[PDB]
RNA sequence: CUAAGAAAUUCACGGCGGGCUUGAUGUCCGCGUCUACCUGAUUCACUGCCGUAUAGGCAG
């Protein structure tokens, strides 16, 4: 969509029990839809008051730790669960496996609007930080950095630079700040061209199979592993329609009766974990919302990446 | 007619973090920011059979053949160092606020009726009985679950954290504040007004809770234990796994939350237990028995329906319990 | 010599290992998981 | 030029190194470990 | 307005029994490391005198 007028940096945010179950096919880091919905919840809660439009999100993930455990004698992993309460008779309830993970991410969220000129930059930065302190990011509480050495503050970098050199200079200053992490971007063109080459190899190939080929460490005979460009992962890239769009007060047991509902299903794209100084433009690497509601296809990606 | 909403969901207010445990010596507790962490390590246990036998394993030949084959595990154990007698358990707690507003509600008529009922309660009697009990469960170190039962002296330090620095510091003797009497004190009531202003306001109030306990040199501490199904197949594995965030033993946040919610002294069965955790159909996991059964009119759901739908306001203790469930959270709703 | 031993109060299934002469921890569960494991693997080694 | 050399009475496997022109001590073992290492790495460098 | 919203794994435990790793062995020939520099930037905030003084001055 539209380009950001400024680039706010929420600092290293600790999330204690995020949803490690991203999707029915992927586990690990939470879905980027969690971060885009979080930024839209931030806009819904302070962006209408500071007259700004917080839009887009850059995911950095300084550290990650899934609450998993590899069982004895297996190559796979399982999830450490919680003990839910008993039922009304004292019987143990049926265990529903939820993944939990401890994250330390920082969010490069793009901000544009008329509120940039009305308030100081540090003022709106402190406002959205004090709002995000009372929120949750993927089902996990945001730990607010109390009584450590020093709180990591904000810096709203203005994307409009007086030069190209000043723009690259404070961009390099920001990239040094979010440097111990690993930026997550949407790489769907590489998945599409990998589909084309794999279809050239053997026809009627799905890009589900191209995704699966880009995930696995496949071996080749002369033995040599297939090289992979970068840290290629599968991500859930939004939802696809399974149902016609129902009326607000038509579907039974919705969340609300003023919003149209539609039964949907995940869409598994591809993402790439790269170091944040590779991109040379932090105006990119932001995850936006692309609905196109008449067709379905509610999805998120990083447009203007390459 | 004002029927019950089909999707009800309240977010968890009183959100704690994972209680990191570290260890050092008492009477240098004020320099306890570089105390080394209590680490979870492995040890082999070997036991004889001590369970009850099922009356077909009571043949003395079968018993003597059984006790010649012991049963070997490798448990996780967390001990203090041999030159450190104090366990420092340190977690943070966000008191969020907006305690009555549901995160999801279907019927807007039911939503406004619930907001009117909650505001009727708050304007009538604010969060002053509830936050007093939450300040008690922060004050006595009940979140020290088994690390409290044999301690010589437990001291809890609670620091209100403003934008980057401490705004107000408390200090309690957690053994004097009992585990069953919600009495009155000046500092406890100051903490109660702080948690009340947290739960009533729009923004969050953040507290840092530190608890020290003199256990003894090298004694065993009890971090949270992990619930893992599928322990493994056809090998030897661990029977007991302890929680540890980053090579540092820890209590789960939901165990700290269950300790903080242990305020319910109003369940109709006698208080041989004392306070229990605030839950709909209030069910103690260790007891295995669910008090506040729906057979009596004293669980959460029927009290909420009588309070909101047909305006049958219950006793002040029971509506304390109902608003304590609303602070607790939950996912409610029928088909 | 029994292949599985349920520790009854503690909800643990111990499977006999032949290398060392002892039982080792197999999985959690009670009498139902014990009987199901007996049906799958057969008792008495 | 052979990649492995078993010293037969002394139960030592010597693997050829190319930097210095000599064999160096690889591991212990006899003809079976030598044949297994030949099957894994291939002889004749 | 975040595969949203919720959650106590836990009580007990004896891993010890015992033991010979050994014989043998040539690392070794050969070699050019040179070239050229401001440690000084106030870089020694010193010693003492008058004064009751630490207040304030003075001398070199």
PDB file of C-alpha atoms in Angstrom, chain A residues 17-133:
ATOM      1  CA  UNK A  17       3.948 -17.475  25.828  1.00  0.00           C
ATOM      2  CA  UNK A  18       3.357 -16.785  22.169  1.00  0.00           C
ATOM      3  CA  UNK A  19       1.514 -19.215  19.935  1.00  0.00           C
ATOM      4  CA  UNK A  20       4.208 -21.518  18.590  1.00  0.00           C
ATOM      5  CA  UNK A  21       1.524 -23.214  16.474  1.00  0.00           C
ATOM      6  CA  UNK A  22       1.513 -20.821  13.524  1.00  0.00           C
ATOM      7  CA  UNK A  23      -0.621 -22.953  11.269  1.00  0.00           C
ATOM      8  CA  UNK A  24      -1.889 -26.520  10.734  1.00  0.00           C
ATOM      9  CA  UNK A  25       1.275 -27.238   8.744  1.00  0.00           C
ATOM     10  CA  UNK A  26       3.916 -25.063  10.439  1.00  0.00           C
ATOM     11  CA  UNK A  27       5.132 -24.660  14.003  1.00  0.00           C
ATOM     12  CA  UNK A  28       7.734 -22.340  15.394  1.00  0.00           C
ATOM     13  CA  UNK A  29       7.689 -18.610  15.047  1.00  0.00           C
ATOM     14  CA  UNK A  30       4.132 -17.218  15.200  1.00  0.00           C
ATOM     15  CA  UNK A  31       2.348 -16.184  12.047  1.00  0.00           C
ATOM     16  CA  UNK A  32       3.062 -12.720  10.613  1.00  0.00           C
ATOM     17  CA  UNK A  33      -0.687 -12.137  10.739  1.00  0.00           C
ATOM     18  CA  UNK A  34      -0.312 -11.903  14.509  1.00  0.00           C
ATOM     19  CA  UNK A  35       2.068  -8.981  14.082  1.00  0.00           C
ATOM     20  CA  UNK A  36      -0.020  -7.223  11.442  1.00  0.00           C
ATOM     21  CA  UNK A  37      -3.131  -7.677  13.572  1.00  0.00           C
ATOM     22  CA  UNK A  38      -1.190  -6.389  16.558  1.00  0.00           C
ATOM     23  CA  UNK A  39      -0.197  -3.256  14.666  1.00  0.00           C
ATOM     24  CA  UNK A  40      -3.795  -2.785  13.571  1.00  0.00           C
ATOM     25  CA  UNK A  41      -4.892  -3.177  17.196  1.00  0.00           C
ATOM     26  CA  UNK A  42      -2.341  -0.512  18.128  1.00  0.00           C
ATOM     27  CA  UNK A  43      -3.823   1.720  15.435  1.00  0.00           C
ATOM     28  CA  UNK A  44      -7.328   0.934  16.696  1.00  0.00           C
ATOM     29  CA  UNK A  45      -6.356   1.886  20.249  1.00  0.00           C
ATOM     30  CA  UNK A  46      -4.040   4.929  19.961  1.00  0.00           C
ATOM     31  CA  UNK A  47      -3.756   5.727  16.257  1.00  0.00           C
ATOM     32  CA  UNK A  48      -7.231   7.249  16.234  1.00  0.00           C
ATOM     33  CA  UNK A  49      -6.154   9.517  19.115  1.00  0.00           C
ATOM     34  CA  UNK A  50      -2.734  10.608  17.862  1.00  0.00           C
ATOM     35  CA  UNK A  51      -4.173  11.129  14.330  1.00  0.00           C
ATOM     36  CA  UNK A  52      -1.581   8.790  12.826  1.00  0.00           C
ATOM     37  CA  UNK A  53      -1.918   5.602  10.797  1.00  0.00           C
ATOM     38  CA  UNK A  54       0.337   2.860  12.132  1.00  0.00           C
ATOM     39  CA  UNK A  55       0.590   0.459   9.214  1.00  0.00           C
ATOM     40  CA  UNK A  56       2.996  -2.333   8.339  1.00  0.00           C
ATOM     41  CA  UNK A  57       5.357  -4.164  10.684  1.00  0.00           C
ATOM     42  CA  UNK A  58       8.957  -5.313  10.504  1.00  0.00           C
ATOM     43  CA  UNK A  59       9.696  -8.466  12.473  1.00  0.00           C
ATOM     44  CA  UNK A  60      13.213  -8.867  13.863  1.00  0.00           C
ATOM     45  CA  UNK A  61      13.168 -11.578  16.636  1.00  0.00           C
ATOM     46  CA  UNK A  62      16.351 -11.033  18.635  1.00  0.00           C
ATOM     47  CA  UNK A  63      15.837 -14.384  20.361  1.00  0.00           C
ATOM     48  CA  UNK A  64      13.360 -17.242  20.327  1.00  0.00           C
ATOM     49  CA  UNK A  65      12.762 -20.279  22.510  1.00  0.00           C
ATOM     50  CA  UNK A  66       9.961 -22.727  21.871  1.00  0.00           C
ATOM     51  CA  UNK A  67       8.749 -24.595  24.929  1.00  0.00           C
ATOM     52  CA  UNK A  68       9.401 -27.935  23.288  1.00  0.00           C
ATOM     53  CA  UNK A  69      11.067 -31.163  24.303  1.00  0.00           C
ATOM     54  CA  UNK A  70      12.618 -33.809  22.108  1.00  0.00           C
ATOM     55  CA  UNK A  71      11.476 -37.218  23.399  1.00  0.00           C
ATOM     56  CA  UNK A  72      13.914 -40.053  23.956  1.00  0.00           C
ATOM     57  CA  UNK A  73      14.633 -42.009  20.803  1.00  0.00           C
ATOM     58  CA  UNK A  74      12.751 -39.718  18.405  1.00  0.00           C
ATOM     59  CA  UNK A  75      13.989 -37.147  15.921  1.00  0.00           C
ATOM     60  CA  UNK A  76      10.790 -35.121  16.263  1.00  0.00           C
ATOM     61  CA  UNK A  77       9.666 -32.777  19.039  1.00  0.00           C
ATOM     62  CA  UNK A  78       6.592 -32.379  21.239  1.00  0.00           C
ATOM     63  CA  UNK A  79       5.166 -29.424  23.122  1.00  0.00           C
ATOM     64  CA  UNK A  80       5.285 -28.686  26.827  1.00  0.00           C
ATOM     65  CA  UNK A  81       1.680 -28.175  27.852  1.00  0.00           C
ATOM     66  CA  UNK A  82      -0.132 -26.514  30.726  1.00  0.00           C
ATOM     67  CA  UNK A  83      -2.345 -28.200  33.288  1.00  0.00           C
ATOM     68  CA  UNK A  84      -5.865 -26.912  32.755  1.00  0.00           C
ATOM     69  CA  UNK A  85      -8.323 -27.134  35.671  1.00  0.00           C
ATOM     70  CA  UNK A  86     -10.581 -30.090  36.293  1.00  0.00           C
ATOM     71  CA  UNK A  87     -14.222 -30.349  35.273  1.00  0.00           C
ATOM     72  CA  UNK A  88     -17.150 -30.106  37.675  1.00  0.00           C
ATOM     73  CA  UNK A  89     -16.795 -33.766  38.638  1.00  0.00           C
ATOM     74  CA  UNK A  90     -13.041 -33.706  39.248  1.00  0.00           C
ATOM     75  CA  UNK A  91     -12.052 -35.531  36.076  1.00  0.00           C
ATOM     76  CA  UNK A  92      -9.056 -34.405  34.057  1.00  0.00           C
ATOM     77  CA  UNK A  93     -10.228 -32.431  31.040  1.00  0.00           C
ATOM     78  CA  UNK A  94      -9.342 -33.433  27.502  1.00  0.00           C
ATOM     79  CA  UNK A  95      -5.929 -31.984  26.768  1.00  0.00           C
ATOM     80  CA  UNK A  96      -5.811 -29.588  23.816  1.00  0.00           C
ATOM     81  CA  UNK A  97      -2.211 -29.113  22.738  1.00  0.00           C
ATOM     82  CA  UNK A  98      -1.184 -25.471  22.548  1.00  0.00           C
ATOM     83  CA  UNK A  99       2.351 -24.490  21.642  1.00  0.00           C
ATOM     84  CA  UNK A 100       4.056 -21.852  23.737  1.00  0.00           C
ATOM     85  CA  UNK A 101       7.232 -19.951  22.961  1.00  0.00           C
ATOM     86  CA  UNK A 102       9.301 -17.163  24.471  1.00  0.00           C
ATOM     87  CA  UNK A 103      10.112 -14.459  21.950  1.00  0.00           C
ATOM     88  CA  UNK A 104      12.188 -11.305  21.974  1.00  0.00           C
ATOM     89  CA  UNK A 105      11.162  -9.357  18.877  1.00  0.00           C
ATOM     90  CA  UNK A 106      11.303  -5.708  17.883  1.00  0.00           C
ATOM     91  CA  UNK A 107       8.687  -4.213  15.601  1.00  0.00           C
ATOM     92  CA  UNK A 108       9.545  -1.773  12.843  1.00  0.00           C
ATOM     93  CA  UNK A 109       6.064  -0.397  12.307  1.00  0.00           C
ATOM     94  CA  UNK A 110       5.474   2.235   9.654  1.00  0.00           C
ATOM     95  CA  UNK A 111       3.567   5.352  10.680  1.00  0.00           C
ATOM     96  CA  UNK A 112       2.120   8.073   8.449  1.00  0.00           C
ATOM     97  CA  UNK A 113      -0.388  10.822   9.089  1.00  0.00           C
ATOM     98  CA  UNK A 114      -0.985  14.392  10.164  1.00  0.00           C
ATOM     99  CA  UNK A 115      -0.153  13.595  13.779  1.00  0.00           C
ATOM    100  CA  UNK A 116       3.584  13.655  13.096  1.00  0.00           C
ATOM    101  CA  UNK A 117       3.566  17.445  12.866  1.00  0.00           C
ATOM    102  CA  UNK A 118       1.224  18.006  15.806  1.00  0.00           C
ATOM    103  CA  UNK A 119       3.212  16.119  18.457  1.00  0.00           C
ATOM    104  CA  UNK A 120       6.911  15.483  19.111  1.00  0.00           C
ATOM    105  CA  UNK A 121       8.291  12.216  17.792  1.00  0.00           C
ATOM    106  CA  UNK A 122       9.367  10.998  21.236  1.00  0.00           C
ATOM    107  CA  UNK A 123       5.893  11.812  22.554  1.00  0.00           C
ATOM    108  CA  UNK A 124       4.029   9.537  20.137  1.00  0.00           C
ATOM    109  CA  UNK A 125       6.791   6.958  20.499  1.00  0.00           C
ATOM    110  CA  UNK A 126       6.314   6.902  24.270  1.00  0.00           C
ATOM    111  CA  UNK A 127       2.535   6.832  23.769  1.00  0.00           C
ATOM    112  CA  UNK A 128       2.543   3.726  21.590  1.00  0.00           C
ATOM    113  CA  UNK A 129       5.116   2.101  23.874  1.00  0.00           C
ATOM    114  CA  UNK A 130       2.969   2.692  26.951  1.00  0.00           C
ATOM    115  CA  UNK A 131       0.033   1.277  25.017  1.00  0.00           C
ATOM    116  CA  UNK A 132       1.926  -1.795  23.790  1.00  0.00           C
ATOM    117  CA  UNK A 133       3.033  -2.500  27.349  1.00  0.00           C
TER     118      UNK A 133
END
